[PDB]
Amino acid sequence: GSHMSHLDNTMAIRLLPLPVRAQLCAHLDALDVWQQLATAVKLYPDQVEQISSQKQRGRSASNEFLNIWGGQYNHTVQTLFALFKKLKLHNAMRLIKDYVSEDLHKYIPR
């Protein structure tokens, strides 16, 4: 699954407040699965280097990741949703649900 014809339109990541995204990046950082994100969307190893080195300085790899995948190529929170579905991170989902379309109102508990 890679093609969807983009039959949907969500708020561009560029709009997503960075200071807010830091909450999720920090969270997933503890899971130590940052590499499962970059590779999941297929990225050049040259870009991964910039992230790895940054993490060495008490930082979050996910933070830098978003700065690249969400600033140079631009995207939407839509694709980000189905992304977490990889490791079945129900937590990460509800973490950034108030930012996606209301069409998500179905899986949410109660």
PDB file of N, CA, C and O in Angstrom, residues 3-47:
ATOM      1  N   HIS A   3      -0.167   3.876  -2.835  1.00  0.00           N
ATOM      2  CA  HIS A   3      -0.993   4.790  -3.616  1.00  0.00           C
ATOM      3  C   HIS A   3      -2.414   4.846  -3.066  1.00  0.00           C
ATOM      4  O   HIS A   3      -3.017   3.813  -2.770  1.00  0.00           O
ATOM      5  N   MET A   4      -2.942   6.058  -2.928  1.00  0.00           N
ATOM      6  CA  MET A   4      -4.294   6.251  -2.417  1.00  0.00           C
ATOM      7  C   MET A   4      -5.017   7.342  -3.199  1.00  0.00           C
ATOM      8  O   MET A   4      -6.181   7.639  -2.934  1.00  0.00           O
ATOM      9  N   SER A   5      -4.310   7.936  -4.161  1.00  0.00           N
ATOM     10  CA  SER A   5      -4.871   8.997  -4.996  1.00  0.00           C
ATOM     11  C   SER A   5      -5.202  10.239  -4.172  1.00  0.00           C
ATOM     12  O   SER A   5      -5.743  11.213  -4.696  1.00  0.00           O
ATOM     13  N   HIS A   6      -4.868  10.197  -2.884  1.00  0.00           N
ATOM     14  CA  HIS A   6      -5.126  11.316  -1.983  1.00  0.00           C
ATOM     15  C   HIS A   6      -6.571  11.799  -2.106  1.00  0.00           C
ATOM     16  O   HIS A   6      -6.825  12.943  -2.484  1.00  0.00           O
ATOM     17  N   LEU A   7      -7.512  10.920  -1.780  1.00  0.00           N
ATOM     18  CA  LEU A   7      -8.929  11.255  -1.850  1.00  0.00           C
ATOM     19  C   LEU A   7      -9.352  12.075  -0.635  1.00  0.00           C
ATOM     20  O   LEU A   7     -10.528  12.404  -0.474  1.00  0.00           O
ATOM     21  N   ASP A   8      -8.385  12.402   0.216  1.00  0.00           N
ATOM     22  CA  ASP A   8      -8.650  13.185   1.416  1.00  0.00           C
ATOM     23  C   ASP A   8      -7.725  14.396   1.487  1.00  0.00           C
ATOM     24  O   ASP A   8      -6.725  14.464   0.772  1.00  0.00           O
ATOM     25  N   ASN A   9      -8.064  15.348   2.351  1.00  0.00           N
ATOM     26  CA  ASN A   9      -7.258  16.554   2.509  1.00  0.00           C
ATOM     27  C   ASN A   9      -7.262  17.028   3.959  1.00  0.00           C
ATOM     28  O   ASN A   9      -8.265  17.546   4.451  1.00  0.00           O
ATOM     29  N   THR A  10      -6.133  16.845   4.637  1.00  0.00           N
ATOM     30  CA  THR A  10      -5.999  17.254   6.030  1.00  0.00           C
ATOM     31  C   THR A  10      -5.042  18.433   6.162  1.00  0.00           C
ATOM     32  O   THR A  10      -4.278  18.729   5.243  1.00  0.00           O
ATOM     33  N   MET A  11      -5.092  19.107   7.308  1.00  0.00           N
ATOM     34  CA  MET A  11      -4.227  20.256   7.559  1.00  0.00           C
ATOM     35  C   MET A  11      -2.758  19.881   7.391  1.00  0.00           C
ATOM     36  O   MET A  11      -2.257  18.971   8.053  1.00  0.00           O
ATOM     37  N   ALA A  12      -2.075  20.588   6.495  1.00  0.00           N
ATOM     38  CA  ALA A  12      -0.661  20.340   6.233  1.00  0.00           C
ATOM     39  C   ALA A  12       0.147  20.347   7.524  1.00  0.00           C
ATOM     40  O   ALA A  12      -0.140  21.108   8.448  1.00  0.00           O
ATOM     41  N   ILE A  13       1.161  19.490   7.576  1.00  0.00           N
ATOM     42  CA  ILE A  13       2.023  19.385   8.745  1.00  0.00           C
ATOM     43  C   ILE A  13       2.668  20.732   9.069  1.00  0.00           C
ATOM     44  O   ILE A  13       2.956  21.027  10.231  1.00  0.00           O
ATOM     45  N   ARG A  14       2.888  21.546   8.040  1.00  0.00           N
ATOM     46  CA  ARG A  14       3.493  22.861   8.223  1.00  0.00           C
ATOM     47  C   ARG A  14       2.702  23.675   9.243  1.00  0.00           C
ATOM     48  O   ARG A  14       3.254  24.527   9.938  1.00  0.00           O
ATOM     49  N   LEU A  15       1.404  23.399   9.323  1.00  0.00           N
ATOM     50  CA  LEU A  15       0.526  24.089  10.260  1.00  0.00           C
ATOM     51  C   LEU A  15       0.686  23.511  11.662  1.00  0.00           C
ATOM     52  O   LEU A  15       0.626  24.237  12.655  1.00  0.00           O
ATOM     53  N   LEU A  16       0.889  22.198  11.730  1.00  0.00           N
ATOM     54  CA  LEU A  16       1.065  21.507  13.003  1.00  0.00           C
ATOM     55  C   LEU A  16       2.140  22.192  13.851  1.00  0.00           C
ATOM     56  O   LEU A  16       3.320  22.161  13.499  1.00  0.00           O
ATOM     57  N   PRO A  17       1.751  22.822  14.978  1.00  0.00           N
ATOM     58  CA  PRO A  17       2.701  23.508  15.862  1.00  0.00           C
ATOM     59  C   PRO A  17       3.837  22.593  16.307  1.00  0.00           C
ATOM     60  O   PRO A  17       3.605  21.559  16.933  1.00  0.00           O
ATOM     61  N   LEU A  18       5.064  22.980  15.975  1.00  0.00           N
ATOM     62  CA  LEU A  18       6.242  22.198  16.334  1.00  0.00           C
ATOM     63  C   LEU A  18       6.342  21.979  17.849  1.00  0.00           C
ATOM     64  O   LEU A  18       6.537  20.848  18.294  1.00  0.00           O
ATOM     65  N   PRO A  19       6.213  23.047  18.671  1.00  0.00           N
ATOM     66  CA  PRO A  19       6.296  22.924  20.133  1.00  0.00           C
ATOM     67  C   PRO A  19       5.327  21.882  20.684  1.00  0.00           C
ATOM     68  O   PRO A  19       5.531  21.348  21.774  1.00  0.00           O
ATOM     69  N   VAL A  20       4.273  21.600  19.927  1.00  0.00           N
ATOM     70  CA  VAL A  20       3.276  20.620  20.339  1.00  0.00           C
ATOM     71  C   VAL A  20       3.695  19.213  19.922  1.00  0.00           C
ATOM     72  O   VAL A  20       3.545  18.260  20.687  1.00  0.00           O
ATOM     73  N   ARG A  21       4.216  19.092  18.706  1.00  0.00           N
ATOM     74  CA  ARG A  21       4.658  17.802  18.185  1.00  0.00           C
ATOM     75  C   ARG A  21       5.758  17.209  19.060  1.00  0.00           C
ATOM     76  O   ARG A  21       5.934  15.991  19.110  1.00  0.00           O
ATOM     77  N   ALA A  22       6.496  18.077  19.746  1.00  0.00           N
ATOM     78  CA  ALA A  22       7.580  17.646  20.620  1.00  0.00           C
ATOM     79  C   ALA A  22       7.082  16.667  21.681  1.00  0.00           C
ATOM     80  O   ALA A  22       7.851  15.865  22.208  1.00  0.00           O
ATOM     81  N   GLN A  23       5.789  16.741  21.987  1.00  0.00           N
ATOM     82  CA  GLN A  23       5.187  15.862  22.982  1.00  0.00           C
ATOM     83  C   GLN A  23       5.168  14.418  22.494  1.00  0.00           C
ATOM     84  O   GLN A  23       5.473  13.494  23.248  1.00  0.00           O
ATOM     85  N   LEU A  24       4.806  14.232  21.229  1.00  0.00           N
ATOM     86  CA  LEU A  24       4.744  12.900  20.639  1.00  0.00           C
ATOM     87  C   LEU A  24       6.142  12.372  20.339  1.00  0.00           C
ATOM     88  O   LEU A  24       6.437  11.204  20.584  1.00  0.00           O
ATOM     89  N   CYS A  25       7.000  13.239  19.810  1.00  0.00           N
ATOM     90  CA  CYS A  25       8.366  12.851  19.479  1.00  0.00           C
ATOM     91  C   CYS A  25       9.079  12.321  20.714  1.00  0.00           C
ATOM     92  O   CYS A  25       9.749  11.288  20.666  1.00  0.00           O
ATOM     93  N   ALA A  26       8.927  13.037  21.821  1.00  0.00           N
ATOM     94  CA  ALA A  26       9.538  12.642  23.081  1.00  0.00           C
ATOM     95  C   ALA A  26       9.006  11.291  23.541  1.00  0.00           C
ATOM     96  O   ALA A  26       9.747  10.463  24.071  1.00  0.00           O
ATOM     97  N   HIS A  27       7.709  11.084  23.339  1.00  0.00           N
ATOM     98  CA  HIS A  27       7.059   9.843  23.735  1.00  0.00           C
ATOM     99  C   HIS A  27       7.636   8.655  22.970  1.00  0.00           C
ATOM    100  O   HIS A  27       8.182   7.725  23.565  1.00  0.00           O
ATOM    101  N   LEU A  28       7.509   8.700  21.650  1.00  0.00           N
ATOM    102  CA  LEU A  28       8.005   7.634  20.787  1.00  0.00           C
ATOM    103  C   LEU A  28       9.508   7.436  20.963  1.00  0.00           C
ATOM    104  O   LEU A  28      10.038   6.363  20.677  1.00  0.00           O
ATOM    105  N   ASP A  29      10.188   8.476  21.435  1.00  0.00           N
ATOM    106  CA  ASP A  29      11.629   8.415  21.649  1.00  0.00           C
ATOM    107  C   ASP A  29      11.988   7.329  22.656  1.00  0.00           C
ATOM    108  O   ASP A  29      13.002   6.644  22.513  1.00  0.00           O
ATOM    109  N   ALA A  30      11.150   7.176  23.676  1.00  0.00           N
ATOM    110  CA  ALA A  30      11.378   6.171  24.708  1.00  0.00           C
ATOM    111  C   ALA A  30      11.200   4.764  24.150  1.00  0.00           C
ATOM    112  O   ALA A  30      11.831   3.815  24.617  1.00  0.00           O
ATOM    113  N   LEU A  31      10.339   4.638  23.146  1.00  0.00           N
ATOM    114  CA  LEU A  31      10.075   3.347  22.519  1.00  0.00           C
ATOM    115  C   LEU A  31      11.267   2.890  21.685  1.00  0.00           C
ATOM    116  O   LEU A  31      11.369   1.717  21.325  1.00  0.00           O
ATOM    117  N   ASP A  32      12.165   3.825  21.383  1.00  0.00           N
ATOM    118  CA  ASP A  32      13.352   3.522  20.587  1.00  0.00           C
ATOM    119  C   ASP A  32      12.969   2.882  19.256  1.00  0.00           C
ATOM    120  O   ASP A  32      13.455   1.804  18.908  1.00  0.00           O
ATOM    121  N   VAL A  33      12.093   3.554  18.516  1.00  0.00           N
ATOM    122  CA  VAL A  33      11.642   3.057  17.222  1.00  0.00           C
ATOM    123  C   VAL A  33      11.632   4.171  16.180  1.00  0.00           C
ATOM    124  O   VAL A  33      10.800   4.180  15.272  1.00  0.00           O
ATOM    125  N   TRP A  34      12.565   5.109  16.316  1.00  0.00           N
ATOM    126  CA  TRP A  34      12.661   6.230  15.388  1.00  0.00           C
ATOM    127  C   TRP A  34      13.040   5.748  13.990  1.00  0.00           C
ATOM    128  O   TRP A  34      12.545   6.266  12.989  1.00  0.00           O
ATOM    129  N   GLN A  35      13.920   4.754  13.934  1.00  0.00           N
ATOM    130  CA  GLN A  35      14.365   4.197  12.662  1.00  0.00           C
ATOM    131  C   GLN A  35      13.207   3.538  11.920  1.00  0.00           C
ATOM    132  O   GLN A  35      13.193   3.490  10.689  1.00  0.00           O
ATOM    133  N   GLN A  36      12.238   3.031  12.676  1.00  0.00           N
ATOM    134  CA  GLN A  36      11.073   2.374  12.090  1.00  0.00           C
ATOM    135  C   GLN A  36      10.149   3.387  11.432  1.00  0.00           C
ATOM    136  O   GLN A  36       9.183   3.015  10.767  1.00  0.00           O
ATOM    137  N   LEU A  37      10.444   4.667  11.626  1.00  0.00           N
ATOM    138  CA  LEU A  37       9.645   5.732  11.035  1.00  0.00           C
ATOM    139  C   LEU A  37      10.252   6.166   9.705  1.00  0.00           C
ATOM    140  O   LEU A  37       9.596   6.112   8.665  1.00  0.00           O
ATOM    141  N   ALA A  38      11.507   6.604   9.755  1.00  0.00           N
ATOM    142  CA  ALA A  38      12.220   7.038   8.559  1.00  0.00           C
ATOM    143  C   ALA A  38      12.151   5.978   7.464  1.00  0.00           C
ATOM    144  O   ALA A  38      11.712   6.250   6.347  1.00  0.00           O
ATOM    145  N   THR A  39      12.596   4.768   7.791  1.00  0.00           N
ATOM    146  CA  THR A  39      12.587   3.662   6.841  1.00  0.00           C
ATOM    147  C   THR A  39      11.170   3.330   6.384  1.00  0.00           C
ATOM    148  O   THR A  39      10.955   2.955   5.230  1.00  0.00           O
ATOM    149  N   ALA A  40      10.207   3.460   7.293  1.00  0.00           N
ATOM    150  CA  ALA A  40       8.810   3.175   6.971  1.00  0.00           C
ATOM    151  C   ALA A  40       8.333   4.006   5.785  1.00  0.00           C
ATOM    152  O   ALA A  40       7.520   3.547   4.982  1.00  0.00           O
ATOM    153  N   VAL A  41       8.841   5.231   5.678  1.00  0.00           N
ATOM    154  CA  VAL A  41       8.465   6.121   4.586  1.00  0.00           C
ATOM    155  C   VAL A  41       9.552   6.161   3.518  1.00  0.00           C
ATOM    156  O   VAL A  41       9.462   6.922   2.554  1.00  0.00           O
ATOM    157  N   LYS A  42      10.578   5.331   3.701  1.00  0.00           N
ATOM    158  CA  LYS A  42      11.692   5.255   2.758  1.00  0.00           C
ATOM    159  C   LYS A  42      12.406   6.597   2.641  1.00  0.00           C
ATOM    160  O   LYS A  42      11.927   7.510   1.967  1.00  0.00           O
ATOM    161  N   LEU A  43      13.556   6.709   3.296  1.00  0.00           N
ATOM    162  CA  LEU A  43      14.335   7.942   3.262  1.00  0.00           C
ATOM    163  C   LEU A  43      15.804   7.652   2.979  1.00  0.00           C
ATOM    164  O   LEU A  43      16.285   6.543   3.213  1.00  0.00           O
ATOM    165  N   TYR A  44      16.514   8.657   2.474  1.00  0.00           N
ATOM    166  CA  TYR A  44      17.928   8.511   2.161  1.00  0.00           C
ATOM    167  C   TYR A  44      18.754   8.387   3.441  1.00  0.00           C
ATOM    168  O   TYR A  44      18.519   9.111   4.409  1.00  0.00           O
ATOM    169  N   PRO A  45      19.736   7.465   3.466  1.00  0.00           N
ATOM    170  CA  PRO A  45      20.592   7.253   4.640  1.00  0.00           C
ATOM    171  C   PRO A  45      21.373   8.506   5.027  1.00  0.00           C
ATOM    172  O   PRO A  45      21.813   8.645   6.168  1.00  0.00           O
ATOM    173  N   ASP A  46      21.543   9.416   4.071  1.00  0.00           N
ATOM    174  CA  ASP A  46      22.270  10.657   4.319  1.00  0.00           C
ATOM    175  C   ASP A  46      21.492  11.561   5.269  1.00  0.00           C
ATOM    176  O   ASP A  46      22.080  12.309   6.051  1.00  0.00           O
ATOM    177  N   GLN A  47      20.167  11.487   5.195  1.00  0.00           N
ATOM    178  CA  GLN A  47      19.304  12.294   6.051  1.00  0.00           C
ATOM    179  C   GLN A  47      19.219  11.692   7.450  1.00  0.00           C
ATOM    180  O   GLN A  47      19.094  12.413   8.441  1.00  0.00           O
TER     181      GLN A  47
END
